Design a protein around this ligand. Structure first.
Ligand SMILES: Nc1ncnc2c1ncn2[C@@H]1O[C@H](COP(=O)(O)OP(=O)(O)OP(=O)(O)O)[C@@H](O)[C@H]1O
Ligand SMILES: [Zn+2]
Length: 69
């Protein structure tokens, strides 16, 4: 089932690339219509980035959660 290919890829993508800042914790994310938004940092590092005043690692990558556009 092609939807399963997409799901399995998104599981892998989420697992293998942790937070860009601490490089250990998984990333924060949200689901937004038919898309998965994976933010660049875990919540801990994101909250801290606000406290320290660094926007460098702010950002996200959106992913279609299904196989067919
Ligand atoms: N965990 C995270 N890692 C990296 N960037 C993040 C994370 N959470 C939020 N951001 C991004 O940091 C920026 C500042 O976030 P904030 O929530 O203060 O503003 P916002 O405009 O309400 O965010 P958004 O545009 O997502 O609604 C936004 O571009 C937001 O997408
Ligand atoms: Zn982190």
């Amino acid at each position: 089932d092609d939807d399963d290919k997409k799901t399995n890829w998104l599981k892998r993508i989420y697992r293998v690339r942790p937070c860009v800042k601490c490089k250990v914790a998984p990333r924060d994310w949200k689901v937004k219509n038919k898309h998965l938004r994976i933010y660049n940092m875990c919540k801990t590092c994101f909250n801290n980035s606000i406290d320290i005043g660094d926007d460098t690692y702010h950002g996200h990558v959106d992913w279609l959660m299904y196989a067919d556009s």
